Amino acid sequence: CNSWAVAPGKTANGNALLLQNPHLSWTTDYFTYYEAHLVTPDFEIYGATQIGLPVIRFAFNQRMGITNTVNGMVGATNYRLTLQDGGYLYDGQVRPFERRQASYRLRQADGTTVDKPLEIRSSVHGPVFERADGTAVAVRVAGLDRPGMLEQYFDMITADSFDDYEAALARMQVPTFNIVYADREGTINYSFNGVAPKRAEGDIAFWQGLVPGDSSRYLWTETHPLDDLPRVTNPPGGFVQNSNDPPWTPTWPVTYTPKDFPSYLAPQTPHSLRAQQSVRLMSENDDLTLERFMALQLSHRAVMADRTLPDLIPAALIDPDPEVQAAARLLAAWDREFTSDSRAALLFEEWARLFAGQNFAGQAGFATPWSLDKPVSTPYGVRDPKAAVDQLRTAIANTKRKYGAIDRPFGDASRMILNDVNVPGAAGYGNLGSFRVFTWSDPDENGVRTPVHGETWVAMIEFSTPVRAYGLMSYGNSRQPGTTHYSDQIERVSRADFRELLLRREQVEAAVQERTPFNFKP
Amino acid sequence: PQAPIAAYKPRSNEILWDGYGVPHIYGVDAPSAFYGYGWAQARSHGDNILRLYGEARGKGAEYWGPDYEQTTVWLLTNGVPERAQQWYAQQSPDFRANLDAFAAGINAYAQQNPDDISPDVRQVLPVSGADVVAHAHRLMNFLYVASPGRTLGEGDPPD
């Protein structure tokens, strides 16, 4: 996911800008987004939300808007139990489980059901599961006493002011997510949100692993209020952002550092090249217009190539294999953009898969390591160029195996295909530096691949009066069999041709193609 | 201090759908708009919504068999369906009425357009305000925050 909010002072017209840009699976059902517009006499909300949710999580209106990104808030603990004498060891004593006899029905191949018993055991930590390898694990989830999740979102998105928004947010009923806010009065805000247990010791990695389940030492009971969490409001730099990076460069210059917060809230790991581009694209640009904001969102730079090709290319040209030399010259002539017509991009990805792992997040290959002191210009360089050239040799073979040649156009292999619509792809993997994201699948037998994850709902809003907003939904507004509204936006996505989002009654009345009167009686 | 444009004041309940299947739901009060929103989601995504609500009930195994069993065990063991009943009761009266209306919207869509609902998910209807709460509770707390994978040690790709 990406998120940007821009203060008035950083824009040409003097109105805040907001980007909504979540990245999730294109197929997982509960991750499907749906666009809609609700209007009553007392509120108005426009935007996207996961199907089945009755409130819009990615909302805006004439006054304000929010967006969300995944922050991985560590709101649960998995505890390793030590089993002993039919109970579990805890503070030097054996303690018996709570146990309940439940049951459920299981449908059989012939349409009937059988009754299946299900024992539910619990320790003081929580419900107990047995892993395949025999490890007994109790899971303890925070915020089970927070019934107001949906209402909190609803009050946040209909807030009459920033003060009303923050009081809603402060209820701590939404257990995770980074949340970014902007409004027509000029306020912008980033909050690292969620329900995080107060602990006395241990960093994030310790609390992400199996915590010992044999002691009250590690049994947390309380959680952090909103003002214990990383937040930024109207910073000197005039913007906030988050692209799933840890919350340590949400703006530039920064307003806090990792020492200001307990070490279990968020990782201190290298920021992804996409997250580095996010900071650069906002910080380096001033006097922003909506049009420019939208152009910057299409950024699809192979930043990883900028960090490696200067060392890789000369090293590869030393090699006696003429195919490696030719690969080197193909990469050297590349403008390092993930465009449809790029002949070098696929080959570059296959090299990066080896150099930085299959997820492209590996750090061991670089000469200069990542540092928070140079958060948007490290890591850099190739540590062992001879080894890297051997990786290129393998990647050449991999590229020909997968795609048929080392120089097949990126957009001929990378396609966006829904029903009978088939259009050329551009942009790519976030961890390679592409800001706009299409996480391409492994290729089929003809070398054709499509996005499994990436751009879904994409909207950009200027809080002028009236507001002006544009957006697209990659996979349409419907997935019901036979709908004409699954594949009808993807061609526009392939050209970055955004729809004007229509909030004013008069605009809606000009665009209407179907009218459903309804009436509700409780 | 320039004020925003005048808010529109709906005088009847209606969805104006645009050419891309985006619903513009106008309601004369909050419950009406939530009902309209439920109707719209059922038109656009009803099959998968019903399936997911079925699972958040803890009835995946019962409705659809062994492929849904592991999720059923995860959710019953973590007490999700019952906790959703509790959370529903714990709602503020005004917001509970919005939830009831959203559910009635789904039910009404299906009642009036039964041809649009896939056979395997018809057994899920009717849905309730509590079903809505339960799916949200599953999504936030037992997909996003606490995943079956991290607890059971099935630790591999993002999905």
Residue A204 is part of a domain; what is its CATH number? 3.60.20.10
Nearest to A495 by CA among A358, A385, A340, A354: A340
Contacts with B51 from chain A: Cβ below 8 Å: 29
Residues A253 and A284 placed together within one structural domain of the fold? no
d(CA A433, CA A306): 10
Mutate to test the interface with B, among A98, A107, A149, A498 (most CBs of B within 10 A): A107
Contacts of A273 (CB under 8 A, 6+ apart): A303, A304, A307, A430, A431, A432, A433
**Residue A86: DSSP 8-state:** T
Nearest CA in chain A to B19: A513
CATH of the domain at B142: 1.10.439.10
Query: B33–A40: do the CB atoms touch at under 8 Å?
Result: yes
**Chain B: residue whose CA lies nearest to A481:** B116
Q: What is the dihedral of CA A265, A270, A276, A282, to 10 degrees?
A: 20
Q: Say which of B76, B136, B145 has its CB closest to residue A73.
A: B145
Give yes or no for A148 touching B (CB within 8 A). Answer: yes
DSSP string, A91-129: TTEEEPPEEEEEEEEEE-TTS-EEEEEEEEEE-SSSBEE
Residue in chain A nearest B65 by alpha carbon: A107
Q: Are strands A76-80 and A210-212 parallel, antiparallel or unpaired?
A: parallel
Residue A520 is assigned to a structural domain of this protein: no
Residues contacting A365, CB < 8 A, separation 6+: A308, A355, A356, A382, A383, A384, A388
Residues A263 and A287 in one domain: no
Name the residue facing A52 among B14, B17, B53 (closest C-beta): B53
Tokens matching residue A8: 């008035």
**Same domain, yes or no: A278 and A247:** no
Query: Residue type for A268, please?
Result: Q
Domain that holds residue B69: 1-159
**A360: chain B residues, CB-CB within 8 Å:** none
Q: How far apart are CA A450 and CA A473, in angstroms?
A: 16
Do A299 and A435 share a domain, yes or no?
A: yes
| Total Cβ atoms within 10 A of residue A363 | 14
**Is A389 within the bounds of a domain?**
yes
The resolution, in Å, is: 2.2
Query: What's the rounded Cα separation, in Å, for the pair A51 and A48?
Result: 9
Peptide bond into A230 cis (omega under 30): no
Angstroms from B45 CA to nearest CA on chain A: 6
Task: State how far the Cα of A165 lies from the Cα of A187, in Å rounded to an integer.
Answer: 11
Q: Which of A1, A38, A128 to mutate to test the interface with B (most CBs of B within 10 A)?
A: A38
Domain of residue A23, residue span: 1-75+142-267+451-508
* Rounded Cα–Cα distance for residues A387 and B68 (Å): 47
Is residue A307 located within the same domain as residue A412? yes
B47, B78, B145 member nearest A175 (Cβ): B145
Contact between A437 and A427 under an 8 Å Cβ cutoff? The reply is yes
Closest in A44, A453, A502 to B7, CB measured? A44
Distance CA A401, CA A413 (A): 13
Total structural domains in chain B? Answer: 1
Contacts of B54 (CB under 8 A, 6+ apart): B60, B63, B64, B121, B123, B124
Amino acid type, A308:
T
A124 and A113 together in one domain: yes
Residues in chain A: 522
Same domain, A294 and A397: yes
Distance CA B131, CA B142 (A): 15
Three-state secondary-structure class, residue A368: strand
Chain A positions touching B18 (Cβ under 8 A) are: 502, 508, 511-513
Evaluate whether residue A522 is within a structural domain. Answer: no
| Residue B66 vs residues A105, A173, B118: alpha-carbon distances, Å | 10, 34, 19
Instruction: Mark yes or no for CB contact B77/A131 under 8 Å.
Output: no
Lookup: tokens for A80: 């390793």
Contact status of A446 with chain B (Cβ, < 8 Å)? no
What are the backbone dihedrals phi and psi of residue A95, each rounded to the nearest 5 degrees, phi first?
-130, 130
Report the domain count for chain A: 3
For chain A, give the longest Cα–Cα distance.
Answer: 80
Contacting residues for B6 by C-beta, under 8 A, at least 6 apart? none
Q: Which of A18, A39, A364, A363 is nearest to B12 (CA)?
A: A39
Question: What's the CA gap between A499 and A476, in Å, rounded?
Answer: 12
Give me the phi and psi of B37, to 5 degrees please.
-70, -35
A49 and A160 both lie in a single domain: yes
Residue tagged 């928004």 (tokens): A165
The per-residue b/e assignment along A377-403, b for 16 or more CB within 10 angstroms, e otherwise, is: ebbbbbbebeebbebbbebbebbbebb
